[PDB]
Structures are given as structure tokens and as C-alpha cells.
Amino acid sequence: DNQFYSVEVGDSTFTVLKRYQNLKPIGSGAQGIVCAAYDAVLDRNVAIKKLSRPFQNQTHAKRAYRELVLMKCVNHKNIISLLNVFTPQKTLEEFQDVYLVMELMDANLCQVIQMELDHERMSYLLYQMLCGIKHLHSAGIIHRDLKPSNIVVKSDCTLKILDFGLARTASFMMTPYVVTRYYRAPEVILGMGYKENVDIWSVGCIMGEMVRHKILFPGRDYIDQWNKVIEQLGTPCPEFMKKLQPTVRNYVENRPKYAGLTFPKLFPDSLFPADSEHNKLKASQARDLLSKMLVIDPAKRISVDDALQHPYINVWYDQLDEREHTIEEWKELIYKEVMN
Ligand SMILES: CC(C)NC(=O)N[C@H]1CC[C@H](Nc2ncc3ccc(=O)n(C4CCCC4)c3n2)CC1
């Protein structure tokens, strides 16, 4: 009779359509819990994400609403695709949970970073990240929080980005969970305003970490993080700092100065495959792209288009809503998106 059934998966209770069999947990971010499952109707494996009471506050609601709207209308091979969406609840009054069904991938980028990776696979992963970012920028979406945990890959080295980043507004939370700030651009760190190549910084951080196998710019807060940035890349020029609001100008200009490191010193020959002439050249090219992505001043940083054109990468070449609402308003907005 009923077209749903329920099973326990850790703390949570997954109540899912009967087509979805043999649920297995595979991770848990901020918005919810995620299971792998077999889709008996499609004869394929899927990932199912549970959003619990997403309308419970502004922060969750805006994120859920945005993700649902964007995942449905954005169509690209390097952006995770929405296969199905449902709630087991029958009315707006009873409505609680939303379940998103997506293609099932094999790993996080975190896991891939830890591996020794050849240039063929590093450049291919980067290419795909850039193509995806490009797509988002063309659709009016500047991500600003690209990070390895929200990028997934398959064994065949296919790459998809999982989320659409920050809201243009931006907040307060209760759930004890730490946000990963390590990949954010200087302009996000310092609060400057940004353009599309804000996301290049993040790709630079990811690329660099693939080579060094350590997070480039860690720290408890933006204070420590900014210190790690300037210790490595050196203090930026005056031209840059003229672009900063008065109070953040004063902070940045009064921190201990550093000359920084050359990119050969930041990413030495040691870290690269460089045994054949092929690899010698690809290493050279790799460090050159890195040097162009990890630059503090966005005015001097490489664009997405110039990056896709770069020799390391080009071998692979081939409505609006952002407003405030109460709980009950959000709950209905999300419910009707779910019952399209
Ligand atoms: C032990 C070893 C075999 N694997 C492991 O440790 N982690 C894998 C296990 C399989 C995971 N696949 C996958 N596919 C689609 C999605 C879609 C949305 C989403 O939010 N996620 C989360 C990101 C990572 C956590 C879940 C998705 N995850 C990747 C991570």
C-alpha cells in the first residue's frame, strides 16, 4: 500500500521510496546525512541526502531552498545532477524532511589529494574543476567556498562539484560543526568584494595541496589564516592595500611583514614527478599555473578562461531570490519546490 519505508542509519531515520534499497551511510556534512543505495527502477546506485527540517532557521532554509532550485535548473557534466527529490510527508502541515537523490560517486577530493597523482590525472581533475566553475560563472553563480570536501570523483576520474557556495547576503548556528575556511580567497578572508576569479584562488589551494599533500593555509580563524598566506606568498603590494576599506587596511598594513617565498621554494622539484622529459616539462608548467592562481591581489590573478587555455590544462580542451522570510514562509517555499 504505502510507497515508502523506513530504516535506521546511525542516529537518523531514513524514510525513503521503495525503489531505493540496501541503504548504507557514506558521510555526513552540515546540511545532513548521506547514504548510498540501489535504485531498483533505474538499476543503478544513487546517493541519498536527508535534509531534516531545513526550514528550521534562516541559514538552513536559504541553503536548502537555493540548493534545490539551482540543482534542478543547472545542467552540466561537472556539477552533481539531481536524479529525484521527495518527502515522505503527505501535507504542508506534516512536512518535515526532504530527500535529495543524486548520482553516486566513489570519493571526496580529500581522498584523492592524499594520493600520489600523475600529471595526466592532476591536469584532468583541474580541467574539469575549471569547466564546472566556468559554467557556474556563466549562470551567474560565483561559488566562493570551493573546497575538497564538496568535490567528488569517480574511479574513471570524472569530477563533479557538489554545491553552489555562499549566499550573496551572509548568519548564526547552534549545531557544533566547524566550517572549513582554508580554501577561501583573500577577498573573502578580508571582506573586500570579488569577481569571478575569486574561485581561482580556491583551485590554487587545491592544486597546491595535491603537490605538497599538506593544507596550504590552515589556522583557527581568518587571523591565523591571513598570517599563513603572507608568510608564504609574502606581504602584498601597496596598490593592493589601497583597495581595502579603511579598517581592514590598518589591520593588514600593521601585521608583521614577510618577503615571502619564490614558487620554486614553495613547490620544489622534489614534489613532482620529473624523471622523463615529459614529466620535466609538465612539472615546469604545473608550477607556472600555481604561481598564477595563488596570487593575493585578484587584479593580478589568472582568470578562469586564461587558466583553461594554459598549457598544463588545455590538452583536455574540446527567477532571482535572496530575501528574508519567517519559518512558516520558508517551510512552504521549500515544500512547493519539493512538490514541483
Ligand atoms: C571508505 C571509502 C570507500 N570511502 C569514503 O571514505 N568516502 C566516500 C564514500 C562515497 C561518497 N560518494 C558520494 N556520492 C555522491 C554524493 C552527493 C552528495 C554528497 O553530499 N555526498 C557526500 C560527500 C562525501 C560524503 C558524502 C556524496 N558522496 C564519497 C566519499
Side-chain angles (χ1 to χ4, degrees), residues 1-318 320-340:
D1 301 43
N2 182 25
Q3 65 181 41
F4 297 90
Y5 78 97
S6 88
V7 279
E8 304 302 323
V9 176
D11 303 338
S12 200
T13 293
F14 272 66
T15 294
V16 298
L17 285 161
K18 277 176 177 171
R19 65 187 281 176
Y20 297 117
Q21 292 303 319
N22 194 29
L23 269 65
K24 293 196 188 307
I26 59 166
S28 177
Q31 256 296 344
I33 317 94
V34 192
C35 289
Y38 172 68
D39 181 353
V41 163
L42 261 27
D43 193 31
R44 77 189 261 194
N45 306 117
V46 296
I48 305 172
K49 182 166 176 190
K50 186 185 175 189
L51 284 16
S52 299
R53 304 275 262 184
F55 51 84
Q56 69 190 272
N57 66 74
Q58 298 301 306
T59 303
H60 291 207
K62 286 194 103 165
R63 175 66 151 76
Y65 178 67
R66 179 180 168 85
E67 164 186 34
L68 207 55
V69 176
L70 293 187
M71 263 213 276
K72 271 197 279 186
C73 64
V74 174
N75 188 17
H76 189 266
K77 63 172 189 169
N78 306 113
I79 303 293
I80 195 69
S81 247
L82 233 199
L83 303 195
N84 197 16
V85 178
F86 62 86
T87 176
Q89 291 92 37
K90 299 178 209 173
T91 64
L92 175 50
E93 337 313 316
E94 297 171 279
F95 173 52
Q96 278 192 244
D97 312 312
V98 184
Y99 294 85
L100 312 182
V101 184
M102 295 154 276
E103 168 165 11
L104 178 68
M105 306 287 275
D106 293 318
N108 244 358
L109 247 192
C110 293
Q111 297 166 242
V112 169
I113 274 164
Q114 300 162 28
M115 315 184 323
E116 220 179 54
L117 288 155
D118 53 296
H119 289 300
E120 310 310 296
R121 289 324 198 182
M122 194 163 339
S123 60
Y124 182 50
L125 292 180
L126 294 174
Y127 165 76
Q128 286 181 101
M129 289 189 235
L130 288 166
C131 280
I133 290 158
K134 172 63 170 299
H135 190 74
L136 298 174
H137 292 174
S138 75
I141 304 159
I142 303 178
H143 200 286
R144 273 171 298 142
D145 205 25
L146 215 79
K147 63 188 87 175
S149 54
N150 67 31
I151 301 170
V152 285
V153 318
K154 274 197 293 167
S155 284
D156 66 5
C157 268
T158 299
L159 185 148
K160 295 184 193 299
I161 296 153
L162 284 182
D163 68 351
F164 304 92
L166 275 28
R168 269 149 240 183
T169 34
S171 189
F172 171 62
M173 55 176 153
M174 318 305 298
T175 304
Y177 91 89
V178 306
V179 185
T180 298
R181 290 167 197 280
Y182 310 149
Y183 302 88
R184 297 185 176 181
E187 48 257 56
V188 179
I189 297 183
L190 293 170
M192 306 166 50
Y194 59 87
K195 60 186 189 176
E196 1 284 276
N197 74 344
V198 71
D199 290 326
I200 286 288
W201 177 269
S202 302
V203 172
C205 288
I206 288 164
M207 184 175 179
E209 184 172 347
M210 282 167 177
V211 170
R212 184 187 281 185
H213 305 286
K214 297 209 284 279
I215 296 158
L216 296 194
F217 309 120
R220 295 172 290 169
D221 39 30
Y222 286 143
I223 289 290
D224 295 322
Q225 191 173 336
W226 181 242
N227 287 325
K228 287 308 312 179
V229 176
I230 61 177
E231 277 175 30
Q232 286 177 91
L233 298 186
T235 308
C237 299
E239 58 179 355
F240 173 73
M241 296 188 301
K242 295 207 296 268
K243 306 210 281 166
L244 309 171
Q245 287 197 41
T247 322
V248 50
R249 220 237 214 181
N250 182 272
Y251 160 64
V252 173
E253 282 188 347
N254 276 275
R255 301 309 276 176
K257 296 229 295 286
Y258 305 86
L261 273 61
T262 74
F263 271 89
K265 280 232 190 293
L266 282 165
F267 302 97
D269 307 329
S270 314
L271 298 172
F272 287 99
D275 43 351
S276 59
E277 293 283 349
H278 176 75
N279 280 343
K280 283 177 164 155
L281 181 69
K282 288 289 167 202
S284 171
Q285 293 173 342
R287 183 194 289 101
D288 180 76
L289 177 62
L290 262 169
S291 78
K292 288 168 172 42
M293 294 185 153
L294 296 168
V295 331
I296 296 173
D297 175 358
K300 275 38 185 186
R301 194 182 303 147
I302 192 172
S303 72
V304 177
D305 306 288
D306 285 335
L308 280 164
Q309 283 295 305
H310 189 277
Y312 193 65
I313 291 165
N314 68 28
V315 307
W316 304 108
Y317 173 84
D318 258 310
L320 191 80
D321 193 30
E322 210 76 57
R323 191 166 75 271
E324 190 158 37
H325 290 284
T326 65
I327 292 164
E328 270 270 83
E329 287 168 355
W330 273 127
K331 183 182 188 189
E332 184 150 41
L333 269 162
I334 293 175
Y335 184 62
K336 55 206 204 185
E337 269 295 322
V338 162
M339 314 296 251
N340 50 271

